[PDB]
Design a protein around this ligand. Structure first.
Ligand SMILES: NC(=O)c1ccc[n+]([C@@H]2O[C@H](COP(=O)([O-])OP(=O)(O)OC[C@H]3O[C@@H](n4cnc5c(N)ncnc54)[C@H](O)[C@@H]3O)[C@@H](O)[C@H]2O)c1
Lengths: 500, 502, 497, 505
């Protein structure tokens, strides 16, 4: 931790616009805290609408110059690979910064950095692999081709839970395709995003190709979603902000890519491996204290093992070790902010008022070393049902609900009874049964006998209200491409429809 | 005669909506009179549906989707059903084309071309249906299997324009059915005739109840239900930019995917080394086919300065000779515009143009000619002495009007052509194919024609850069609008992580 | 027979015309059910085959079919599909007459054939090549896919029209010209499909049918310099010979040869399902199937139970005329084929295997005059034996036991072949593990036999070269051209001035 | 430019292995036979390597099979396989200088040609490393209810790989990179006369680290080990680049065990120059097409077709430039053309001069070994232009593979196409004209795997390379190149299996 804090004395405090590190246009700043102790650890520029506008216009200018958009795909790939190698070179420092900024355990952060390296490498290898299609034209004496071009100028807005990971999923395909980008990380977690911009600057990109805005989404976010020069807005975050962004993007018919949260089901059958299912229900529920887009917040367990399951899960929940993400014995860190802890605490009261049981946790911990930090106990809510707000709404904290089901049909019905559709799991040693269930769940990713894995080779995103579009995989790249049909008529003749 | 044969078809055509396997009236029994724009006579009366009718249709589409009868059908069989629709179109080609000319006013030859195109669209998607169900991924995690499955998106609402009703319907219906979606379509309230007919033909083919639904009515009544209902998974709209933006904002309320095609300010770029009489011929065709009521109409001519005066005088001469008339008369070259309201809008743009300093070189008003006095006619029009700052140059007029701007260099043509909010389609005319190819690369247009104007086809994707839309129709990209990806990851050797204390 | 054939052509089809053999030779075709002559056809010469190849080349270069739009080619292929369905009943009867198989098998073939033509009809216009993002500044790179040109196509006697459709449909969809030669023994449905294609209408020389003995015309069809791809389905020995002769003009080959196809039955299989599917794997078309499940591998813990159950069912199989609805298994195809099956029984006994049931021609009076052979089960076998390793291609299965999953895999993969096979187990995880380790082009889990146009089919190892069906099937009939345009050409000036 | 890039004997060979590499060990020939390697610039013996036996090749093949079946490479994740292939690409670049020098020493080509080769080689490995994890197969929408249908793409298995002497390490890379990326085991044999960079790249791969038996290097003559490599029952694919006669022999031998073949066999590549070409450019590129690597290039522009209108001007401009070509040591910066590869090969080229004369063609310039004192001991042959020839002639039809072009005239576009296509081959060719529409019409009608419009020579990993007609079977490079090293498996699962009950019970 003192090592990580020492990293801060060389980190930039500034935005990066059109090839220069710059202050906010009004010289405003923001203090960044460590959620473990709520101490101010760092102070950064708080940019303005003018800054956001200047960045978007620089991005457009750079795009039209062609220095990046007309660079060869192979060479773009090499540069993206150079970024991947910087991440690896600096993986420990980056992991330390992430833990400092977001509070999650160092082991969780190291896992993030390994994924981030793999995301940049994947897209580096994909950059030069498909430029479009030749079409067999149905018109004689014509040639028809579809060319994929970069979409242009893309704005990118990321959340506070996995700052550098979510940044990588957007930056990698944007660069690989030849777009120019303007990125804004969550105002409360800018550290690793600043650091990655320093690393990309070292790699070397044309002026204007990459830009970093720092500030509140309520001030600069509308410029980012609403500017006429933007061709795509890509946002990861909560549903209410997502809808707001999409409505503003309509003003200029701007394409949107959204990844919102979910209400992710963890479906546990009679015939599951019991010990495995307990282990994975904990992991699904409490990794990063539940602040995960794909958190397994909604446990559905078959009625014949429900009491035995509840008893085992609760007994394990009482043993979960809370503490500083820098300490090796810590299993769960704090939540992100005062505001967010408050939202979680309020949900406990909502749960009780609508008739649910707080079987364990549901409060801040007492222990003396946890008192300064933004800790909330791991929580299990029982005696609930699908009509309840605690079941339906994304709490995004260290909280799971437990509902029973009788049949495979009932499990599918309950799991699909939410507005969301991001991810979920099915546990059963009957693989045929698990596959039947997976093919009826309206979810972007279904894990059979696992919980959590995503990776660059496979697209990630929502059905229903969990988003629009996909990140990662070949579909992820295509978000950053636009198709052009060029049709050449090799024997052009007058039509002579209109009288001479 | 052909006109009276078309009118006879209406004695046996449905007057109702089609909801959940039944032809039904509007819930409040209101009706709407349909007009022939050639003589402005009322030719048919149809139900005017309610917002609750739209709601019922979407709910029926949801229940049909969840039942799985169409969505779990084999892709190969879904293919065969889509082909059967294609064969109905060709079977009824003459009747459908006549109905289209009766409803939209366009020439019979134009409507025949549409029917050939519609048959090929359905046939393309029928052949595509069973060709790609997803991918197998080499997982980076040992002892896992990773597959991506492509599923139907679900319930789709589909809203189409008055200019090419059945063509635009085909571009939406065909991929929706091929992929296993359930759909709710609403044609333009003004032009329901061929869409009602194609619903009759699809009903004959045979689909599970609720898989297809037809709503009739004015967007202001039912439109917000079609874009805004929670149970829609995708809304697909072709029409104007202001309605498209409205639809997108309303779809956001339930994070509903959108597919938009919104028209354009499509450039037609003529170099001084173009085949001159080809370029004159294609400028006419670009500007005045369907009286300029075309998403891709070449309304903005860009012509190299060295031939600009010759081009203008040649174009003006030919425009004066364009034959306006009844679309059923084989001598007619240009029909009427679609409605009173649209003709007024075009007239109001002549006033704007004149007040901002442009010249109306020829045309620019409704014809006085006695033979055209009862129809919704507007003269083919050429506007000169204009520039890119002008409303008449920037804005989509969607009538039989072209503007002509000069350019000196290749570079200047490109900057003028990209200097609009739009990005649908355009053309470059030049014998120098290398030069045309350089220009095509730098135009921000979904489709660029080299030495042609107008062609689209089912094999290639169609749609906009910039404000001309979101997404693509036709081609494999068209099909993909109607599909959603699911990653199914199976851990074949699951082990406890043991992160949390026991 | 006479009634079925009175209107069928008896000639070859070369360059738009039905023609006799150049030397006027003919061949008598036999019904294997009664060994009676049922039809007489032209027996063409090597000069006829040369003339067809040269017409195919002339047609291809003229461009009438090869430069037709892919969408229109797909419409013509769709028209062939619809003719097949229109004539389903007669085609199926013709196939049963010629090959001996049950009429219900022949209907199933016709339905598959319709689907094969309709799949390739729909694929015809879907993929014309790629645009490439060039690593060289100021260049454009594109890959155009073109028809390969002239293709010669040789089909076997077991599924004449099905195998013909697998080759014809992608050839025509892509724009190739073709010359096809059915097995000399079984020309009837192939002659018929040429009459149907002629009705559909194709430019002269685009399609050609040669009729004759491979011994005479076969080297021309594999060896002629103007052939761009040779496609052959048949036995391994002819396939190697074809490949060697194709080498003379560096001619691409596609080969589908036999298999020694394993049917793996674990002790947690659905038992009666496994018994049913072992029967079907072994004895459909009298075992004369490239993917016949001739090699049963059954877990030792249930081996004796399985053998008793299978043998008991084998004794009930109904042999007979393919036109009689009670018939379950038809005759084998020819005297020489039945003789080879018979020779394998002698081989089996001499190397120490047991003929547990069957193993002989039946002597019952209504089978006496036809080319019947009893369904046969051979036990007390092992992997060292000829009867286990070699493709007998008759109504013959062997049974070997295995102890464990790893032994099942090692036995199943211990042949020269790699066509197809099956795994039966209620543990789907185990079945998937085994599937991934089997070196087979198609692996069925809890099934036996299904193939379809949507999915590629073909061998690992000595079962073939290339794939038929699916997108990979189409790609055999296409060649890639990279066209690279330098849009700012400048002198290199490597060499002094 | 395409084949010449800038920097940005005892010495360089002192640390190089002299042995074969089989099943994880550097090993002598089983009979201790050796072979002297020469520098074609001076005909000096520069190195001595093991000359393997038929039994060495069989042992390598059995090792590769054993490694394949163990699954240590074939079941590694595609992403990890991609990382290893990139580590190879990185070692090429790290050692680019030494590798380029070694390639010039062994093949005689100029150092700037060798630098271009090393840059291409790096890019080949990098391309395939990036492709490794990008397509594992397909999900199929099954036409049978209650079934799941998937196609998986697996490594082919054991591959044997035989490479020619003209671009030894470049050709090795085209084969090694997709084999390793897909998870195959391989056994590679370079040309017996040019082993040096291939030995070096095996040393480098060994440092990267691959399971034992995954990679194997056999050294020796085709006459000795070649039939094992084409003919062994455990081989799943044989990949060969070289001449048509050896390729046909290989294909015939591969047939014995129904082994897939991938062949690239050279060509008779046309260089078509219209009278509206940029003249100066067409002259420059006729020289480049003709005389890079002394014409020892699969895609060499040996057959010039020039439009009659400009034919005389063209011939005199070309001849004047050919007289100025600077022959010499590939290590000297001013050398423009090196020697040819071998005594045997130079003899083949010289013989073709007597074929040309005896059939009535004119040797307009060149046609002999040079006399000049510093060229006398090396395997030099003068750049040669042959005129007054036609398509009936052996000199026009046959691949000479030396610094020799022929010039034919044509009147029309149709005639140029006729002539360009009137050979047994179909590898590559060019069209020069300022009329791009016309170049495009010609390109469409040429039966060639690669057509360049106003350029000559470029190939790259992103696009497939290979022949129509007798220039080969299959493609190397691009996604098609990967697919030679993959085999498809359809796995069909019946999820609700029912008895068929065809056979009575
Ligand atoms: N594609 C090309 O770039 C290329 C390269 C080299 C040569 N060629 C052509 O080949 C002609 C003759 O060339 P060459 O004789 O120097 O080389 P070649 O065609 O024999 O290629 C050499 C390779 O073949 C091997 N070989 C010999 N017998 C074999 C066998 N039975 N099985 C397997 N491999 C065997 C040799 O050991 C060597 O590795 C030349 O005139 C030239 O036209 C083309």
């Amino acid at each position: 931790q003192s090592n990580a804090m020492e990293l801060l004395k060389h980190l930039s405090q500034r935005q990066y616009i059109d090839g220069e590190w710059v202050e906010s246009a009004n010289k405003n700043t923001r203090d960044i805290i460590n959620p473990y102790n709520q101490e101010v650890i760092f102070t950064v520029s708080e940019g303005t609408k003018e800054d956001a506008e200047r960045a978007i216009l620089a991005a457009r200018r750079a795009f039209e110059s062609g220095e990046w958009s007309q660079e060869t795909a192979e060479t773009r790939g090499k540069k993206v690979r150079a970024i991947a190698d910087k991440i690896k070179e600096h993986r420990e420092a980056l992991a330390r910064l992430e833990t400092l900024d977001t509070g999650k355990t160092l082991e969780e952060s190291y896992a993030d950095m390994d994924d981030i390296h793999n995301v940049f490498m994947y897209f580096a290898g994909l950059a030069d692999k498909d430029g479009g299609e030749m079409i067999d034209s149905p018109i004689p004496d014509t040639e028809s081709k579809i060319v994929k071009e970069p979409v242009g100028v893309v704005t990118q807005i990321t959340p506070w839970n996995y700052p550098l990971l979510q940044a990588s999923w957007k930056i990698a395909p944007a660069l690989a395709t030849g777009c120019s980008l303007v990125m804004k990380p969550s105002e409360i977690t800018p550290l690793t995003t600043i650091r990655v911009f320093e690393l990309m600057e070292e790699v070397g990109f044309p002026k204007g190709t990459i830009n970093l805005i720092l500030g509140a989404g309520s001030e600069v976010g509308d410029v980012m979603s609403g500017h006429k020069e933007v061709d795509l807005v890509s946002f990861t975050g909560g549903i209410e902000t997502g809808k707001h962004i999409m409505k503003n993007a309509a003003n200029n018919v701007t394409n949107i890519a959204l990844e919102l949260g979910g209400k992710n089901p963890n479906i546990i059958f009679d015939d599951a491996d019991f010990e495995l299912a307990v282990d994975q229900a904990l992991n699904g529920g409490y990794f990063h204290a539940g602040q995960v887009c794909s958190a397994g917040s909604r446990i559905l367990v078959q009625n014949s093992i429900k009491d035995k399951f509840e008893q085992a899960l609760i007994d394990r929940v009482k043993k979960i070790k809370l503490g500083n993400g820098f300490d090796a014995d810590t299993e769960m860190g704090p939540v992100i902010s005062t505001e967010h802890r408050n939202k979680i605490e309020s949900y406990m009261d909502v749960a009780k008022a609508e008739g649910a049981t707080i079987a364990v946790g549901g409060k801040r911990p007492d222990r003396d070393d946890l008192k300064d930090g933004l800790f909330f106990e791991p929580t299990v809510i029982t005696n609930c049902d699908t009509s309840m707000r605690i079941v339906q709404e994304e709490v995004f904290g260290p909280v799971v609900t437990v509902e029973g089901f009788e049949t495979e049909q009932e499990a599918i019905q309950l799991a699909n009874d939410s507005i969301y559709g991001l991810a979920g799991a099915v546990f059963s040693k009957d693989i045929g049964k698990a596959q039947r269930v997976a093919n009826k769940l309206k979810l972007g990713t279904v894990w059979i006998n696992d919980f959590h894995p995503y990776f660059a080779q496979a697209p990630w995103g929502g059905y229903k209200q969990s988003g629009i579009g996909r990140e990662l995989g070949k579909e992820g790249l295509e978000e950053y491409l636009v198709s052009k049909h060029i049709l050449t008529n090799t024997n052009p003749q007058l039509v002579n429809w209109f009288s001479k």
